[PDB]
PDB file of C-alpha atoms (C1' of nucleotides) in Angstrom:
ATOM      1  CA  UNK I 178     129.561  81.694  14.453  1.00 35.53           C
ATOM      2  CA  UNK I 179     132.740  82.081  11.839  1.00 33.27           C
ATOM      3  CA  UNK I 180     131.938  80.915   8.603  1.00 30.83           C
ATOM      4  CA  UNK I 181     135.271  79.139   7.088  1.00 31.72           C
ATOM      5  CA  UNK I 182     134.857  79.019   3.094  1.00 34.26           C
ATOM      6  CA  UNK I 183     136.631  76.305   1.001  1.00 33.85           C
ATOM      7  CA  UNK I 184     137.306  72.592   0.567  1.00 31.55           C
ATOM      8  CA  UNK I 204     138.048  74.109   5.636  1.00 28.22           C
ATOM      9  CA  UNK I 205     136.509  74.620   8.918  1.00 31.50           C
ATOM     10  CA  UNK I 206     136.550  70.694   9.106  1.00 32.05           C
ATOM     11  CA  UNK I 207     140.423  71.141   9.496  1.00 32.25           C
ATOM     12  CA  UNK I 208     139.904  74.070  11.524  1.00 33.21           C
ATOM     13  CA  UNK I 209     136.729  73.054  13.794  1.00 33.76           C
ATOM     14  CA  UNK I 210     139.152  69.940  14.101  1.00 34.28           C
ATOM     15  CA  UNK I 211     143.025  71.101  15.477  1.00 32.64           C
ATOM     16  CA  UNK I 212     140.696  73.844  17.747  1.00 31.75           C
ATOM     17  CA  UNK I 213     138.845  70.688  19.157  1.00 29.41           C
ATOM     18  CA  UNK I 214     142.196  68.524  19.696  1.00 31.92           C
ATOM     19  CA  UNK I 215     143.734  71.968  21.329  1.00 31.64           C
ATOM     20  CA  UNK I 216     141.124  72.107  24.306  1.00 32.94           C
ATOM     21  CA  UNK I 217     139.416  68.630  24.027  1.00 34.37           C
ATOM     22  CA  UNK I 218     136.600  70.983  24.206  1.00 30.49           C
ATOM     23  CA  UNK I 219     132.972  68.000  24.291  1.00 32.41           C
ATOM     24  CA  UNK I 220     130.319  68.050  22.144  1.00 33.80           C
ATOM     25  CA  UNK I 221     126.288  68.636  23.744  1.00 31.08           C
ATOM     26  CA  UNK I 222     122.920  68.530  23.012  1.00 30.26           C
ATOM     27  CA  UNK I 223     120.090  70.375  24.095  1.00 30.72           C
ATOM     28  CA  UNK I 224     116.393  70.771  23.639  1.00 33.92           C
ATOM     29  CA  UNK I 225     113.991  67.225  24.211  1.00 34.49           C
ATOM     30  CA  UNK I 226     113.243  67.915  20.671  1.00 34.92           C
ATOM     31  CA  UNK I 227     113.953  70.344  17.835  1.00 33.87           C
ATOM     32  CA  UNK I 228     111.845  70.025  13.626  1.00 34.07           C
ATOM     33  CA  UNK I 229     113.770  71.824  10.968  1.00 36.81           C
ATOM     34  CA  UNK I 230     112.778  73.552   7.564  1.00 37.97           C
ATOM     35  CA  UNK I 231     109.124  74.131   8.907  1.00 37.64           C
ATOM     36  CA  UNK I 232     107.124  76.148   6.102  1.00 36.12           C
ATOM     37  CA  UNK I 233     105.409  78.258   7.671  1.00 36.17           C
ATOM     38  CA  UNK I 234     102.320  80.675   6.024  1.00 36.04           C
ATOM     39  CA  UNK I 235     101.879  82.424   8.986  1.00 36.08           C
ATOM     40  CA  UNK I 236     103.960  85.039  10.028  1.00 37.07           C
ATOM     41  CA  UNK I 237     105.035  83.959   5.910  1.00 36.83           C
ATOM     42  CA  UNK I 238     108.464  82.216   5.679  1.00 36.59           C
ATOM     43  CA  UNK I 239     110.363  79.262   7.108  1.00 34.64           C
ATOM     44  CA  UNK I 240     111.151  78.457  10.699  1.00 34.12           C
ATOM     45  CA  UNK I 241     112.586  75.357  13.242  1.00 34.94           C
ATOM     46  CA  UNK I 242     111.558  74.600  16.114  1.00 34.18           C
ATOM     47  CA  UNK I 243     112.767  73.738  19.328  1.00 32.00           C
ATOM     48  CA  UNK I 244     110.433  72.172  21.727  1.00 34.08           C
ATOM     49  CA  UNK I 245     111.574  72.598  25.698  1.00 33.60           C
ATOM     50  CA  UNK I 246     109.471  71.929  29.415  1.00 36.67           C
ATOM     51  CA  UNK I 247     108.401  74.870  29.642  1.00 38.72           C
ATOM     52  CA  UNK I 248     108.168  77.003  26.420  1.00 40.82           C
ATOM     53  CA  UNK I 249     108.515  76.316  22.638  1.00 42.15           C
ATOM     54  CA  UNK I 250     111.169  78.266  20.509  1.00 39.69           C
ATOM     55  CA  UNK I 251     110.621  78.993  16.526  1.00 40.16           C
ATOM     56  CA  UNK I 252     113.991  79.669  14.889  1.00 37.26           C
ATOM     57  CA  UNK I 253     113.872  82.028  11.694  1.00 36.00           C
ATOM     58  CA  UNK I 254     116.531  83.638   9.875  1.00 32.99           C
ATOM     59  CA  UNK I 255     115.266  86.953  10.394  1.00 31.18           C
ATOM     60  CA  UNK I 256     113.573  86.531  13.604  1.00 31.67           C
ATOM     61  CA  UNK I 257     113.521  83.938  17.031  1.00 31.98           C
ATOM     62  CA  UNK I 258     110.276  83.711  18.933  1.00 34.63           C
ATOM     63  CA  UNK I 259     109.700  82.448  22.196  1.00 35.38           C
ATOM     64  CA  UNK I 260     106.259  80.651  23.461  1.00 35.57           C
ATOM     65  CA  UNK I 261     106.129  79.985  26.655  1.00 35.55           C
ATOM     66  CA  UNK I 262     103.536  76.240  25.830  1.00 37.24           C
ATOM     67  CA  UNK I 263     100.859  77.706  29.045  1.00 34.17           C
ATOM     68  CA  UNK I 264     100.076  80.376  26.209  1.00 35.73           C
ATOM     69  CA  UNK I 265      99.300  77.724  23.586  1.00 33.49           C
ATOM     70  CA  UNK I 266      95.753  77.946  23.961  1.00 34.04           C
ATOM     71  CA  UNK I 267      94.260  75.616  21.307  1.00 35.84           C
ATOM     72  CA  UNK I 268      96.538  72.843  18.278  1.00 35.31           C
ATOM     73  CA  UNK I 269      94.462  72.131  15.158  1.00 34.47           C
ATOM     74  CA  UNK I 270      95.736  69.708  12.874  1.00 33.01           C
ATOM     75  CA  UNK I 271      93.735  69.983   9.287  1.00 33.00           C
ATOM     76  CA  UNK I 272      94.280  67.984   5.267  1.00 32.66           C
ATOM     77  CA  UNK I 273      94.481  70.596   3.249  1.00 29.18           C
ATOM     78  CA  UNK I 274      91.722  70.349   0.052  1.00 28.64           C
ATOM     79  CA  UNK I 275      94.329  69.277  -2.068  1.00 26.47           C
ATOM     80  CA  UNK I 276      94.606  66.406  -0.512  1.00 26.67           C
ATOM     81  CA  UNK I 277      98.658  66.696  -0.544  1.00 26.40           C
ATOM     82  CA  UNK I 278      99.403  69.099   2.023  1.00 28.24           C
ATOM     83  CA  UNK I 279      99.089  68.864   6.179  1.00 26.56           C
ATOM     84  CA  UNK I 280      97.289  72.041   8.219  1.00 26.29           C
ATOM     85  CA  UNK I 281      99.092  72.502  11.327  1.00 21.75           C
ATOM     86  CA  UNK I 282      97.750  75.598  13.602  1.00 19.16           C
ATOM     87  CA  UNK I 283      98.735  76.942  16.555  1.00 20.23           C
ATOM     88  CA  UNK I 284      96.644  79.522  18.739  1.00 17.29           C
ATOM     89  CA  UNK I 285      98.830  81.744  20.924  1.00 18.59           C
ATOM     90  CA  UNK I 286      97.853  84.242  23.247  1.00 19.43           C
ATOM     91  CA  UNK I 287      99.237  86.895  23.830  1.00 19.20           C
ATOM     92  CA  UNK I 288      98.854  86.942  19.998  1.00 17.01           C
ATOM     93  CA  UNK I 289     103.240  87.512  18.255  1.00 16.52           C
ATOM     94  CA  UNK I 290     104.212  90.385  17.346  1.00 15.55           C
ATOM     95  CA  UNK I 291     106.421  91.696  14.206  1.00 15.55           C
ATOM     96  CA  UNK I 292     105.676  95.144  14.623  1.00 13.38           C
ATOM     97  CA  UNK I 293     101.977  96.815  13.692  1.00 17.34           C
ATOM     98  CA  UNK I 294      99.038  93.217  13.123  1.00 17.43           C
ATOM     99  CA  UNK I 295      99.503  90.511  15.135  1.00 20.95           C
ATOM    100  CA  UNK I 296      99.635  86.603  14.598  1.00 22.23           C
ATOM    101  CA  UNK I 297      97.078  84.886  16.920  1.00 17.06           C
ATOM    102  CA  UNK I 298      97.307  81.885  14.844  1.00 17.20           C
ATOM    103  CA  UNK I 299     100.715  80.327  13.665  1.00 16.65           C
ATOM    104  CA  UNK I 300      99.967  78.173  10.279  1.00 16.17           C
ATOM    105  CA  UNK I 301     101.825  75.873   9.448  1.00 13.77           C
ATOM    106  CA  UNK I 302     102.093  73.514   6.088  1.00 15.99           C
ATOM    107  CA  UNK I 303     103.537  69.312   5.604  1.00 19.83           C
ATOM    108  CA  UNK I 304     103.662  67.375   2.782  1.00 17.51           C
ATOM    109  CA  UNK I 305     101.110  64.575   4.257  1.00 20.16           C
ATOM    110  CA  UNK I 306     104.293  62.426   2.630  1.00 20.35           C
ATOM    111  CA  UNK I 307     106.915  63.590   4.871  1.00 23.39           C
ATOM    112  CA  UNK I 308     108.395  61.320   7.071  1.00 24.65           C
ATOM    113  CA  UNK I 309     110.551  61.755  10.147  1.00 28.80           C
ATOM    114  CA  UNK I 310     112.009  59.349  12.191  1.00 29.31           C
ATOM    115  CA  UNK I 311     112.905  61.359  16.063  1.00 27.17           C
ATOM    116  CA  UNK I 312     114.056  60.486  19.469  1.00 27.46           C
ATOM    117  CA  UNK I 313     113.277  62.133  22.157  1.00 25.58           C
ATOM    118  CA  UNK I 314     116.477  64.175  24.541  1.00 24.09           C
ATOM    119  CA  UNK I 315     115.386  62.846  27.398  1.00 21.39           C
ATOM    120  CA  UNK I 316     117.134  60.664  30.530  1.00 24.29           C
ATOM    121  CA  UNK I 317     115.157  57.498  31.279  1.00 25.57           C
ATOM    122  CA  UNK I 318     113.954  58.756  34.351  1.00 25.04           C
ATOM    123  CA  UNK I 319     112.802  61.754  33.714  1.00 21.35           C
ATOM    124  CA  UNK I 320     110.631  60.376  30.537  1.00 20.73           C
ATOM    125  CA  UNK I 321     109.234  57.553  32.863  1.00 22.75           C
ATOM    126  CA  UNK I 322     108.687  60.293  35.522  1.00 21.60           C
ATOM    127  CA  UNK I 323     106.786  63.408  34.003  1.00 21.83           C
ATOM    128  CA  UNK I 324     106.786  62.186  30.215  1.00 20.72           C
ATOM    129  CA  UNK I 325     105.230  57.968  30.520  1.00 22.48           C
ATOM    130  CA  UNK I 326     101.738  57.842  28.410  1.00 22.45           C
ATOM    131  CA  UNK I 327     101.974  61.558  27.021  1.00 23.61           C
ATOM    132  CA  UNK I 328     105.324  61.363  24.580  1.00 28.01           C
ATOM    133  CA  UNK I 329     107.067  58.312  23.306  1.00 29.62           C
ATOM    134  CA  UNK I 330     110.343  58.410  23.806  1.00 32.61           C
ATOM    135  CA  UNK I 331     111.184  57.083  19.879  1.00 33.45           C
ATOM    136  CA  UNK I 332     109.068  57.980  16.797  1.00 33.82           C
ATOM    137  CA  UNK I 333     109.035  55.926  14.415  1.00 34.90           C
ATOM    138  CA  UNK I 334     109.916  57.053  10.350  1.00 37.45           C
ATOM    139  CA  UNK I 335     106.364  58.739  10.277  1.00 36.28           C
ATOM    140  CA  UNK I 336     104.613  61.512   8.882  1.00 36.82           C
ATOM    141  CA  UNK I 337     105.974  64.839  10.195  1.00 32.71           C
ATOM    142  CA  UNK I 338     102.600  66.806  10.879  1.00 32.29           C
ATOM    143  CA  UNK I 339     101.813  63.836  13.640  1.00 32.46           C
ATOM    144  CA  UNK I 340     105.045  63.640  15.591  1.00 34.29           C
ATOM    145  CA  UNK I 341     104.793  67.025  15.709  1.00 30.30           C
ATOM    146  CA  UNK I 342     100.963  67.112  16.663  1.00 30.54           C
ATOM    147  CA  UNK I 343     101.800  64.243  19.153  1.00 30.73           C
ATOM    148  CA  UNK I 344     104.588  66.039  20.747  1.00 36.20           C
ATOM    149  CA  UNK I 345     102.465  69.570  21.014  1.00 37.89           C
ATOM    150  CA  UNK I 346     100.208  68.085  22.807  1.00 33.92           C
ATOM    151  CA  UNK I 347     102.338  65.822  25.182  1.00 33.26           C
ATOM    152  CA  UNK I 348     104.635  69.325  26.182  1.00 32.57           C
ATOM    153  CA  UNK I 349     101.539  72.139  25.872  1.00 33.53           C
ATOM    154  CA  UNK I 350      99.150  69.425  28.181  1.00 32.94           C
ATOM    155  CA  UNK I 351      96.563  71.195  24.841  1.00 33.97           C
ATOM    156  CA  UNK I 352      94.304  68.788  22.882  1.00 33.44           C
ATOM    157  CA  UNK I 353      94.871  68.397  19.204  1.00 35.40           C
ATOM    158  CA  UNK I 354      91.089  69.677  17.215  1.00 38.22           C
TER     159      UNK I 354
ATOM    160  C1'  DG L   1      73.153  36.324 -37.823  1.00 38.01           C
ATOM    161  C1'  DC L   2      76.572  33.451 -39.940  1.00 37.99           C
ATOM    162  C1'  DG L   3      80.958  33.438 -42.968  1.00 38.40           C
ATOM    163  C1'  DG L   4      84.861  36.117 -45.227  1.00 37.69           C
ATOM    164  C1'  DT L   5      88.974  39.587 -45.858  1.00 35.73           C
ATOM    165  C1'  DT L   6      93.162  42.075 -43.536  1.00 33.17           C
ATOM    166  C1'  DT L   7      94.045  46.519 -40.610  1.00 35.64           C
ATOM    167  C1'  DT L   8      95.930  47.610 -36.199  1.00 34.24           C
ATOM    168  C1'  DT L   9      95.949  46.943 -31.856  1.00 33.15           C
ATOM    169  C1'  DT L  10      98.142  44.138 -27.555  1.00 33.33           C
ATOM    170  C1'  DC L  11     103.154  42.154 -26.727  1.00 31.37           C
ATOM    171  C1'  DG L  12     107.262  41.884 -25.681  1.00 29.17           C
ATOM    172  C1'  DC L  13     112.670  43.816 -26.369  1.00 28.60           C
ATOM    173  C1'  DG L  14     117.161  46.693 -26.358  1.00 31.39           C
ATOM    174  C1'  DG L  15     118.812  51.825 -27.369  1.00 31.80           C
ATOM    175  C1'  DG L  16     118.622  57.096 -26.802  1.00 37.02           C
ATOM    176  C1'  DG L  17     119.003  61.515 -24.931  1.00 38.85           C
ATOM    177  C1'  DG L  18     115.590  64.487 -23.174  1.00 35.32           C
ATOM    178  C1'  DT L  19     113.650  65.388 -18.514  1.00 33.30           C
ATOM    179  C1'  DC L  20     114.103  64.816 -13.655  1.00 34.56           C
ATOM    180  C1'  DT L  21     116.856  65.985  -9.801  1.00 34.44           C
ATOM    181  C1'  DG L  22     120.294  67.654  -6.238  1.00 33.02           C
ATOM    182  C1'  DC L  23     122.627  71.754  -5.262  1.00 31.78           C
ATOM    183  C1'  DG L  24     123.868  76.701  -5.382  1.00 35.11           C
ATOM    184  C1'  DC L  25     123.051  81.558  -5.010  1.00 36.14           C
ATOM    185  C1'  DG L  26     120.090  85.501  -6.166  1.00 38.29           C
ATOM    186  C1'  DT L  27     116.353  88.310  -6.952  1.00 39.46           C
ATOM    187  C1'  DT L  28     111.454  89.431  -7.835  1.00 38.75           C
ATOM    188  C1'  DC L  29     107.266  89.477  -5.595  1.00 40.30           C
ATOM    189  C1'  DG L  30     104.542  88.247  -1.848  1.00 39.71           C
ATOM    190  C1'  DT L  31     103.441  89.489   3.376  1.00 40.39           C
ATOM    191  C1'  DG L  32     103.360  93.201   6.517  1.00 37.54           C
ATOM    192  C1'  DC L  33     104.154  98.685   7.590  1.00 41.12           C
ATOM    193  C1'  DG L  34     102.459 103.054   7.002  1.00 43.36           C
ATOM    194  C1'  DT L  35      99.164 106.279   5.149  1.00 42.40           C
ATOM    195  C1'  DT L  36      95.867 109.034   1.608  1.00 43.86           C
ATOM    196  C1'  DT L  37      91.511 110.447   0.834  1.00 45.05           C
ATOM    197  C1'  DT L  38      87.293 110.413   2.233  1.00 44.08           C
ATOM    198  C1'  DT L  39      82.027 107.918   4.758  1.00 45.90           C
ATOM    199  C1'  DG L  40      79.808 107.751   8.717  1.00 47.76           C
ATOM    200  C1'  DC L  41      77.912 107.403  13.377  1.00 49.06           C
ATOM    201  C1'  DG L  42      78.738 110.038  17.595  1.00 48.55           C
ATOM    202  C1'  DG L  43      77.612 113.953  20.973  1.00 47.54           C
ATOM    203  C1'  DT L  44      76.556 119.582  21.849  1.00 49.34           C
ATOM    204  C1'  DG L  45      74.646 124.193  23.000  1.00 48.77           C
ATOM    205  C1'  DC L  46      71.251 126.406  21.832  1.00 47.16           C
ATOM    206  C1'  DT L  47      65.891 127.263  19.529  1.00 49.64           C
ATOM    207  C1'  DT L  48      61.041 127.124  19.636  1.00 46.38           C
ATOM    208  C1'  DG L  49      57.778 125.237  21.888  1.00 46.10           C
ATOM    209  C1'  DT L  50      54.392 122.500  25.064  1.00 51.04           C
ATOM    210  C1'  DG L  51      50.905 119.952  29.451  1.00 50.30           C
ATOM    211  C1'  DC L  52      49.735 120.172  33.750  1.00 46.71           C
ATOM    212  C1'  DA L  53      30.062 132.714  59.760  1.00 43.49           C
ATOM    213  C1'  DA L  54      26.538 134.575  61.173  1.00 48.73           C
ATOM    214  C1'  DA L  55      22.512 139.126  60.829  1.00 49.13           C
ATOM    215  C1'  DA L  56      19.773 141.921  58.426  1.00 48.66           C
ATOM    216  C1'  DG L  57      17.048 144.063  54.571  1.00 47.86           C
ATOM    217  C1'  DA L  58      14.997 143.982  49.626  1.00 44.12           C
ATOM    218  C1'  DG L  59      13.452 141.776  46.258  1.00 46.53           C
ATOM    219  C1'  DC L  60      10.403 137.992  43.890  1.00 46.21           C
ATOM    220  C1'  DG L  61       7.120 133.975  41.748  1.00 45.19           C
ATOM    221  C1'  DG L  62       3.966 131.406  42.617  1.00 44.08           C
ATOM    222  C1'  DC L  63      -0.555 131.782  44.526  1.00 47.92           C
ATOM    223  C1'  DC L  64      -4.844 132.402  46.942  1.00 45.54           C
ATOM    224  C1'  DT L  65      -8.968 134.482  48.121  1.00 49.39           C
ATOM    225  C1'  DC L  66     -12.520 137.529  46.797  1.00 49.22           C
ATOM    226  C1'  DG L  67     -14.449 141.477  42.780  1.00 47.35           C
ATOM    227  C1'  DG L  68     -18.079 141.795  39.232  1.00 48.11           C
ATOM    228  C1'  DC L  69     -19.476 140.771  35.969  1.00 48.17           C
ATOM    229  C1'  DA L  70     -21.161 138.374  31.484  1.00 45.83           C
ATOM    230  C1'  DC L  71     -24.311 134.542  30.522  1.00 44.27           C
ATOM    231  C1'  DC L  72     -27.678 130.122  30.399  1.00 45.28           C
ATOM    232  C1'  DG L  73     -32.290 128.631  30.453  1.00 49.53           C
ATOM    233  C1'  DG L  74     -37.233 130.281  31.010  1.00 46.62           C
ATOM    234  C1'  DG L  75     -41.009 133.047  29.279  1.00 46.70           C
TER     235       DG L  75
END
DNA sequence: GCGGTTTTTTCGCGGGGGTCTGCGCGTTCGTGCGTTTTTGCGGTGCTTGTGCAAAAGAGCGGCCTCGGCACCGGG
């Protein structure tokens, strides 16, 4: 990864791409950017795969297997403005000494997101039909995330 | 309750610019890592002490017959 300052990186990319005809690719069934975690404290991108969940953070990357997710809680905060999504993980995530058996995410209730799943029509029909929607309309981010987590981990949302 | 005065509430329109907001970088304060000084329950070795086969003679107590006497009744 290069950092090219100035208004310059797009021209640099175009020349390189044209030189060897580089073809862009798309991975991860679904990604959610800029999610606020209360525990661990910080902001994380959540990338979901068939067998595993990735949390990408500026200082810490975590790979959680879908089997290690024991429980999903979807709980409204009493402030009537934020919604909490809570993951119980076993083994608990580690940052050094004390650990994170619970991941606490905080959403705004008014935050809406539109998301298309990165799946082929044959794989969707065979594995995910009736578990996931092919496209989610502009609904609240925490609902889409809770449904995706339910479909991929096969855990009931509490 | 009924009639009076006339204030200031409600109605609408135009213009100004302070406040909200998109965007960026930095930092300071929230959160985890590690520790200080001390409290508490955990156990032991040892101290101090407890409830669980005839034969025979010798000696003895009870006992009984008996000796012998004093006594009642009468004159």
